[PDB]
Amino acid sequence: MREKLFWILKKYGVSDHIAKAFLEIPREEFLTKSYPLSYVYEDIVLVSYDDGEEYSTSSQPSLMALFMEWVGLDKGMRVLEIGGGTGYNAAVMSRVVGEKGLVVSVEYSRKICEIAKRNVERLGIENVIFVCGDGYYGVPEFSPYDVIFVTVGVDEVPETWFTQLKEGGRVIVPINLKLSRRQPAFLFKKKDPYLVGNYKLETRFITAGGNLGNLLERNRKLLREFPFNREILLVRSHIFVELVDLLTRRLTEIDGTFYYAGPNGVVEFLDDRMRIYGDAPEIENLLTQWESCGYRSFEYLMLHVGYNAFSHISCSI
Amino acid sequence: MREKLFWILKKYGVSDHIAKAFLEIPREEFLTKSYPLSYVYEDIVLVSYDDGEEYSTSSQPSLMALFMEWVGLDKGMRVLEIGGGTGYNAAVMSRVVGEKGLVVSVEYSRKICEIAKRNVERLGIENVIFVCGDGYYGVPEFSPYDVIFVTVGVDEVPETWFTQLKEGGRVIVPINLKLSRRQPAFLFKKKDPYLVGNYKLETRFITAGGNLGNLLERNRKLLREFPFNREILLVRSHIFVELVDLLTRRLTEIDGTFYYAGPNGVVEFLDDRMRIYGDAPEIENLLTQWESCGYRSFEYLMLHVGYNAFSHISCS
Ligand SMILES: Nc1ncnc2c1ncn2[C@@H]1O[C@H](CSCC[C@H](N)C(=O)O)[C@@H](O)[C@H]1O
Ligand SMILES: Nc1ncnc2c1ncn2[C@@H]1O[C@H](CSCC[C@H](N)C(=O)O)[C@@H](O)[C@H]1O
Ligand SMILES: [Cl-]
Ligand SMILES: [Cl-]
Ligand SMILES: [Cl-]
Ligand SMILES: [Cl-]
Ligand SMILES: [Cl-]
Ligand SMILES: [Cl-]
Ligand SMILES: [Cl-]
Ligand SMILES: [Cl-]
Ligand SMILES: [Cl-]
Ligand SMILES: [Cl-]
């Protein structure tokens, strides 16, 4: 029953206003497959749709509640959810933001998105708008948003989301760190022209398709030919490459060699060494900042992701 | 007369092969308005043309001789002269490079250029080619050049000249500084992808027209909209802005405020600080290097002007 889930969330430290949201939405109405109710209200992930071709899951309730607590989701806010699925999380967040708030959710699968629209209608929810398409583009018509809530692993936070986010808005997002076979989730706050934030924990969301899952491939198109400049010894190169992936969103690879596709140069990353073609002073700056921060991995650094500005690292503690 | 001029050039340390060229060219043949011969050979600037609307001047002989010495002008070289005027300096250099050398001289004024052509034609000087046009473009066909010899104040050394210059080639050039309104002359040597050089002395030349005199206006068109990033305080801002003018050649201005029009951002220069819109790590690096070099002005620094590369400052 919903009561047990509500209680379990309270035990997790989830506040009353967010926990109450989970008490008001019947999770079973979002599952296309029948499960015993005792299973429906367990704090676990549930397959919500599976036809052999397409698949979707309802996320672990406590993780979603934590995400909501972390971004400070509350009454009257406007949220852009990426990876709506059959709609359960969107429905829960709709109760959190209340009647004056709004939830816009994007689902890439046409079939799954249509099922979500139906579920929203069946439950009589009037403040949840589902959009069927690639979350990469966001939904500018209903921006600005207070929060960008991502429930699918994405290669990057596209500039679209940044532009659609209010100054001071938050982004909770699981990033596909494919080069390390990991999915770290981060919490960012917008302070134009940056998203400033920190790593939170490892997550297990479905990996995104479309333009939210082909960044390496897309960035190959950004590569240009530049004359060789110089080489620089690089310690813990893999750790730095992870940081370039997260901070620049311009990392790509050709034949297994990773390259930063810069606007004025290309940086080829090798085993504890990097070759610079053209100019990439922004990469030299990240390296200096990283060195000043003890060469620690991304989990222990404050990230300043620039939009129409280069990125930087800080570790003031 | 020319005999006195020669003696003076020698007294200034000018080599014999260069000073001798001044004994072979009649300066009076390049002046359209008669002057007493005793004045013609004084070591000064003379008005060589003036129809009331347009005018040109023959530069100070010793300054030209020094320029020649500094770029190592010698026999068989190919020189691109910018700002040919009525042709006197081109003619003198033609003697230095000899029958096997060549002087390609560009003059922007159609009338003055025609006069220059008539002058070398009349004197039978055959290794001088005058081009009537904007020196901004140089003259690709006759490159590679050993030397680019500039005799007019220019806003920048365009990439065209860099491309047309041999590796190891030299450029002697007076640059129109946008802020201080001075015309310091610099000696550069090409070491792809840079022109590496140093300030030599302050000069006074006619300020170039065409694309060699409208850099601020051209760069204003390169400005783009970028979000405010951050503000950076700095001391001796004017000194730094002049270095940005010289090293980046991307300076512009609107209503008296100078801006660096960068590829990825715009830097607004204020009296005691600069505001960065978008990003300009290349400026951030020049700033750090300048501060490292003691916040000194361009006269004391080694400039590495990049072409298809960002620039750098050194002070070894
Ligand atoms: N590029 C892209 N844009 C928008 N949605 C995507 C996507 N790639 C994947 N997805 C979707 O993201 C989803 C995440 S699982 C659904 C979690 C959802 N918040 C709920 O409450 O059920 C899947 O349904 C999947 O098809
Ligand atoms: N963009 C441009 N390209 C080539 N010449 C230019 C110019 N702008 C100005 N000039 C010219 O540069 C000249 C400099 S005065 C001439 C010095 C000349 N070497 C001589 O011996 O007389 C003037 O004739 C002037 O018209
Ligand atoms: Cl490949
Ligand atoms: Cl591949
Ligand atoms: Cl670089
Ligand atoms: Cl560099
Ligand atoms: Cl930077
Ligand atoms: Cl100053
Ligand atoms: Cl001052
Ligand atoms: Cl910055
Ligand atoms: Cl520098
Ligand atoms: Cl340097």
Phi-psi region of A126 (alpha: psi -120 to 50; beta: other; left: phi over 0): alpha
Q: For domain B202-316, which architecture applies? A: 3-Layer(bab) Sandwich (3.55)
Element (H, E) at A21: helix A16-24
CA–CA gap between residue B177 and residue B251 (Å, rounded): 10
CA–CA gap between residue B160 and residue A92 (Å, rounded): 64
Strand-pair partners of B259: B252, B268
CA–CA gap between residue A220 and residue A259 (Å, rounded): 9
Q: Residue A144, preceding bond cis, omega within 30 degrees?
A: yes
CA–CA gap between residue A285 and residue A270 (Å, rounded): 18
CA–CA gap between residue A303 and residue A199 (Å, rounded): 9
Residue B21 burial (C-beta neighbours within 10 Å; 0-12, 13-18, 19+): buried
Q: Does A193 touch chain B (CB under 8 A)?
A: yes
Residues in chain B: 316
Q: DSSP 3-state assignment of A11?
A: helix
> Any idea which residue has 């009349």 for tokens?
B122
Method: X-ray
Element (H, E) at A199: strand A194-202
* CB B298 within 8 Å of CB B246: yes
**Which amino acid is residue A267, in one-letter code?**
V
Atom 3 of ligand 1, nearest CA residue: A135
Q: How far is CA B125 from CA A71, B79, B86, in A?
A: 81, 15, 14
Q: Residue A193, preceding bond cis, omega within 30 degrees?
A: yes
Strand-pair partners of B191: B194
Q: For domain A202-317, which architecture applies? A: 3-Layer(bab) Sandwich (3.55)
Q: What is the DSSP string of B139-200?
A: -GGGPPEEEEEE-SBBS---HHHHHHEEEEEEEEEEB--TTT--EEEEEEEEETTEEEEEEE
Which residue spans within chain B are E strands per DSSP? Answer: 46-50, 55-58, 78-82, 102-107, 128-132, 145-150, 165-174, 183-191, 194-203, 228-233, 251-254, 257-261, 265-269, 273-278, 302-306, 312-314
Token pair in block for residue A79: 């949220």
Determine whether the interchain pair B229/A193 forms a contact, defined as Cβ–Cβ distance below 8 Å. yes
Determine whether the interchain pair B281/A278 forms a contact, defined as Cβ–Cβ distance below 8 Å. no
CA atoms within 13 A on the CB side of A89: 32
Looking only at the bridges linking them, the beta strands covering A55-58 and A78-82 are unpaired
**Which amino acid is residue B235, in one-letter code?**
V
Determine whether the interchain pair B265/A229 forms a contact, defined as Cβ–Cβ distance below 8 Å. no
Residues whose CB falls within 8 Å of the CB of residue B205, separated by 6 or more in sequence, listed in order: B59, B83, B151, B152, B153, B174, B183
Chain B residues near residue A229 by CB distance under 8 angstroms: 309
* CB A316 within 8 Å of CB A258: no
CA–CA gap between residue A217 and residue A253 (Å, rounded): 8
* CB B237 within 8 Å of CB B281: no
Element (H, E) at B70: helix B61-70
Please state, as a whole number, how many other Cβ atoms lie within 10 Å of the Cβ of residue A112: 24
Q: For domain B1-201, which architecture applies? A: 3-Layer(aba) Sandwich (3.40)
Mutation target to probe the B interface, by most B beta carbons within 10 A, among A282, A308, A311, A312 is A308
Residue B93 phi, psi (nearest 5) = -65, -30
Q: How far is CA A51 from CA A45, A55, B249, in A?
A: 18, 7, 62
Q: How far is CA A63 from CA A8, A183, A203, B165, B230, in A?
A: 12, 14, 9, 65, 36
Buried (b) or exposed (e) across A142-161, using 16+ Cβ within 10 A?
A: bbebbbbbbbbbbbbbbebb
Strand-pair partners of A265: A278
For the CA atoms of chain B, what is the radius of gyration? 21
* CB B237 within 8 Å of CB B274: yes
CA–CA gap between residue A172 and residue B285 (Å, rounded): 34
Please state, as a whole number, how many other Cβ atoms lie within 10 Å of the Cβ of residue A185: 21
* CB B275 within 8 Å of CB B268: yes
Determine whether the interchain pair B309/A263 forms a contact, defined as Cβ–Cβ distance below 8 Å. no
Do B202-316 and B1-201 fall under one CATH topology?
no
B292 is catalytic: no
CA–CA gap between residue A184 and residue A178 (Å, rounded): 10
The gap between the terminal CA atoms of chain A, to the nearest Å, is 43
Chain A residues near residue B281 by CB distance under 8 angstroms: 281-282, 284-285, 310
Chain B residues near residue A309 by CB distance under 8 angstroms: 226-227, 229, 265, 278-279
Looking only at the bridges linking them, the beta strands covering B78-82 and B145-150 are parallel
CA–CA gap between residue B271 and residue B299 (Å, rounded): 21
Looking only at the bridges linking them, the beta strands covering B228-233 and B257-261 are unpaired
Domain residue extents for chain B:
1-201, 202-316
Q: Which atom of ligand 1 is nearest to the CA of A30?
A: 22
Please state, as a whole number, how many other Cβ atoms lie within 10 Å of the Cβ of residue B166: 14
Note the helical H segments in B202-280.
215-220, 237-248
Q: How far is CA A48 from CA A27, A106, A204, B22, B139, in A?
A: 10, 16, 16, 94, 72
Please state, as a whole number, how many other Cβ atoms lie within 10 Å of the Cβ of residue B187: 18
Residues whose CB falls within 8 Å of the CB of residue A235, separated by 6 or more in sequence, listed in order: A272, A295
Nearest to A289 by CA among A266, A273, A311, A257: A311
Residue B290 burial (C-beta neighbours within 10 Å; 0-12, 13-18, 19+): buried
Ligand 2 site-directed mutation target among B59, B89, B94, B108, most atoms within 8 Å of CB: B108
Ligand 2 site-directed mutation target among B29, B120, B152, most atoms within 8 Å of CB: B152
Q: DSSP 3-state assignment of B234?
A: coil
Please state, as a whole number, how many other Cβ atoms lie within 10 Å of the Cβ of residue B151: 28
Q: Does A314 touch chain B (CB under 8 A)?
A: no
